[PDB]
Design a binder for this molecule. Sequence first.
Ligand SMILES: CC1=C(C/C=C(\C)CCC[C@H](C)CCC[C@H](C)CCCC(C)C)C(=O)c2ccccc2C1=O
Ligand code: SF4
Ligand code: SF4
Lengths: 80, 163, 739, 41, 73, 142
Amino acid sequence: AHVVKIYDTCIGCTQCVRACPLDVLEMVPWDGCKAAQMASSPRTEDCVGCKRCETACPTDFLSVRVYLGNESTRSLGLAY
Amino acid sequence: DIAGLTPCSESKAYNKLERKELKVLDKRLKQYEPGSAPYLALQATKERTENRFKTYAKQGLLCGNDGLPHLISDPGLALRFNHAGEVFIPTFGFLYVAGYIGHVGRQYIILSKEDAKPTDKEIILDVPLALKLAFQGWAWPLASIQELRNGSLLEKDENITVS
Amino acid sequence: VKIAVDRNPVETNFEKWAKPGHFSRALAKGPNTTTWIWNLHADAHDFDNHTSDLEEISRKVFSAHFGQLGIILIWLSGMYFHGARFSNYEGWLSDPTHIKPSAQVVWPIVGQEILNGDVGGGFQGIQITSGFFQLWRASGITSELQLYSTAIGGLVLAAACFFAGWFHYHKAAPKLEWFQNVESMLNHHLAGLLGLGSLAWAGHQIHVSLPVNKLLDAGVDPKEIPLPHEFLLNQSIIADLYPSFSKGLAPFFTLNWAEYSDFLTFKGGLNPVTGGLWLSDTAHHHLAIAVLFLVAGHQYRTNWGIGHSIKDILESHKGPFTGNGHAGLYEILTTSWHAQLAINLALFGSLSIIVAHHMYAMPPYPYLATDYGTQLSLFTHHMWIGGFCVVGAGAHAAIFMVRDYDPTNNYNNLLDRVIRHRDAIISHLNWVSIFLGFHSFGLYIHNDTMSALGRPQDMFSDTAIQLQPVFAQWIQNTHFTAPQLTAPNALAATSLTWGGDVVAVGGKVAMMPIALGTSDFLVHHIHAFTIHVTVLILLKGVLFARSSRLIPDKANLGFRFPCDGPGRGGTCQVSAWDHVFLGLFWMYNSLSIVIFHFSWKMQSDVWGTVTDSGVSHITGGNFAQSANTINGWLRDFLWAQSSQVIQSYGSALSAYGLMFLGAHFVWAFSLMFLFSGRGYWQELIESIVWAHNKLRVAPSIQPRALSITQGRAVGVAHYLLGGIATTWSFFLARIIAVG
Amino acid sequence: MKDFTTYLSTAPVVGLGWAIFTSGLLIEINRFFPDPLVFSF
Amino acid sequence: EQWVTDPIHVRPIAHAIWDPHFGQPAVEAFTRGGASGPVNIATSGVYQWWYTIGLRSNQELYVSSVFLALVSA
Amino acid sequence: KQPELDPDTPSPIFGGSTGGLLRKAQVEEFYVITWESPKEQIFEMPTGGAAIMRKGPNLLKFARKEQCMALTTQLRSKFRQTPCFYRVYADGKVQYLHPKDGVYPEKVNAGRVGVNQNMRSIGKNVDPIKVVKFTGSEPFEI
Ligand SMILES: CC1=C(C/C=C(\C)CCC[C@H](C)CCC[C@H](C)CCCC(C)C)C(=O)c2ccccc2C1=O
Ligand code: SF4
Ligand code: SF4
């Protein structure tokens, strides 16, 4: 599906998860300053590739980049 | 004689065009009495049309087989002849005015980079500063060359690139 | 119902101007990007985006209304003053048959004075196709000395209008209780603003019908005509002109309306010599309108237990299928201004187009039927205004549905029932548009193929195989036999477009009956196709705005957004704003087709000059066997009629060709925006900014490319601009050289 | 007065004052000097 | 053959037509040649290039066509 | 304790619509959501209109996964209500997805180990050299 990656450039703002419309990525241990979280993509069978998580990520440069791959029923948002 | 073109007085087509224009003007000029306003308007129009055709034919401008004037833009053909005004001096006049404009705008946009929130000064200009710089740029060739020898216009490679 | 305003709600000061974007706290912080300016411009009027204070929003709207009417009045005053100072209105008035209207004279600078076309009347200038001289002739104006004072009055009224706007915004800002008086707003718009105005204008037309009907149409010079005040007061004059006067005004007290027949007359039609209509018919029509709209504004309970309010009427309308309908539509309207605006613009543009249709075939003025240019101009103008108004109603419907809507208090079973089958409508209208496209456009392909294959006897034609309509012809038959059979007291039919009697004024036929054949059948099917496709676009934009099948969380993204993301194969042009974007293009297409049909019909089968033996039209009846093929529209209409626009450099019509080419230019320029994106442009701006920073001349404000929504906006703007401007130049340079 | 003079640095000023000055100057030069297409010499 | 002799009085022809959709006037309109039915003018410029290199017989063209088919195979 | 799907659950009062529930829902999959909803109230449906909701846990279901995440986020917005998700395949097998941690993936839960990530600065990736395999989209570490 959509190969999603998360680089070390991250602050753990918890925003790319309260913005993702498909609840695809999680945030489990990271050693930060005040919040100490890092994003991760444990599952991708439901990720559509809307690039809504890349808009809210304030990291420069972005912490997450969706490598566009192949399409499916979930990836094409098909109710039929 | 250059490029097979002939001076524009000896052009039968040019005089034929002038006569055509005058006939076309007079045919509808004869519609009004000599006292009304439209008649005076057409009279003045014919005045400056005849003036067009008379004043062009001085110091030499070549008209071709079509009788219309043709500008010579090569320096060297405008020299060795009398055509330096066709387009040779207008080039320098535009260069002067464009310099003037760019110099003033650059010195403005530079002198505003020092104060807090310069963006405001780009939507709410400093009218007195712009007027001052507007009346100080008519020596810009002097300031440009020596500001170039100075080095105060080359940025020492401290800008944003990607490669 | 009462009045409720506040004193000095916002102090008058030039401070809030020094901070552009104050109304948007996001913009007021400062312009750190060049997008700030474009958002300043695109949001200044977005009153419901400034704050959620609907009281302040209603105050802003009620002030912007005066702000618009002030410009309207200054515009009318400018027209009147152009007519007064520099124009041939006296010359036109002494000889309307051949002298052409001109009210704009250019300045002699670079040869532009050639535009001062020789129009006669001892004066030269630019010919005007607005229709002000014919409108002024119906008011007894005899000299230029009156238009000056009329413009003075108009300008004073415009100043007072801006005064009232400032007064009701900064000194008498109302409250939502006053704005939401639907009862008062109706009973004062419907009864007062409409009824009183109609009665006043009818009384005006009654006491001004002396010059136009009798003196102006008797060769009497306007200077010779006694002034209107000399007609109003002197009873001997109005007794000599119309015997029904000086009776004693008795029939109007006892309502014995029997003697008033010289000034309230019902004739219908017009004399093939007088050119125009009569003022008595318009006076009677305006009295009918006054009485009707004055009685209609008295059917609502306001204070004294007389009538019935709107809420009870909405509550007492329910049926088996829907059930509990019209629950909160009164609140729908009283809550949001966008709902009222969309509902208004819904039929406002439609009635504008209906006014166009009622003006082209029913010229309500004297000495303009022979003026073949003003009719086309006004018709096309009003049709494009109506198209824009309809598309704007479609946009404001979704606007209402986005910000000011919640199905809890404004709940209505009607709206939710419409929503619950929001997909069957779209699917069936898709199928119907496919039907019409294969059955209204494919016919032209068949006709071209048959004419090309060398089989003219197989092509669709009024001679080979007829496909003309009869229902419209049956309507024309019911209207033709209406006099003396279904309309006893009537004299003539509804219009001379289906009743023969070729009326001609000075060679030029003022009106000739319009035929309806296979060509009109095909073109009306094309019109229905285009209109249905436009309605499809607009409605599919309006409905799929709160929710959809793909993205459920669509309401939070707002009304004005380009997309959601390249996911699920790609999402582009999903917002209702983009559906309005496409509806603008479809409205362009439909209105253009309709106006070309109008022009070519009027020039082929209607207009012309009458000789001793019949009438010789402009074109040799090229409408019959050219409309049946797409090539015909390029065979005898577009190719043939474009000679003047490209051949007008020798005359005062060269500006028309200049606008022609410039509109082509701006059209392709719009194509530029429509076919490109931002990535390329943003990176090109990046390299240009690099070039700048080498000499230290870049701006402090970050130069960014236009927003995607603004990119599409500029695209559609230039596109419609170029299109409408080219068609304007064509229809306005072609019709001057043939009238 | 102060806020008015500050307002007079935006689009409704030079950009109007400018380009009005320039249109006027060019029109006057083309009016007094009717039809130039080449310099004096 | 009709082109080599008097290359000025004649124009090229490309191919014929078996389209049943044409009417009688169509067969009379696509018959510039006169030796066959409907045809189409040849704008490929092949006659000039084939005659300049030397060719005055249709058999010399059949040979080359067969040769090119063989090299394609 | 992540709760599993329970059939025969009552539904909210609603008339109908034309969204979802197609041939895909019968032979491929359908998603389920359950949530408390006390104080019988009015809500909006993502593929329909407004509806009522009794008090006590109530269960819904739609076609696409986002059609339920939208409702979960809504519930965040107004009143603190805590729904869940479910998956269904052709064999009838059910899978629980949201929230597996029980604490709403936006917040960490005591401890786990994530995948699909690498400790490298943004950029500084590998050039197309030595990437001839290309393995679709490379994880760059596997
Ligand atoms: C060119 C282009 C742009 C770039 C658009 C730009 C750069 C518009 C900028 C032009 C304006 C007019 C600049 C003018 C401002 C001046 C610096 C100052 C004004 C001059 C005064 C005298 C008023 C897009 O943003 C775009 C977006 C989507 C699809 C296609 C395109 C597209 O093709
Ligand atoms: S691309 Fe969309 S669905 Fe995929 S992880 Fe990002 S926000 Fe979630
Ligand atoms: S949005 Fe970006 S910066 Fe914020 S937690 Fe997610 S990956 Fe890190």
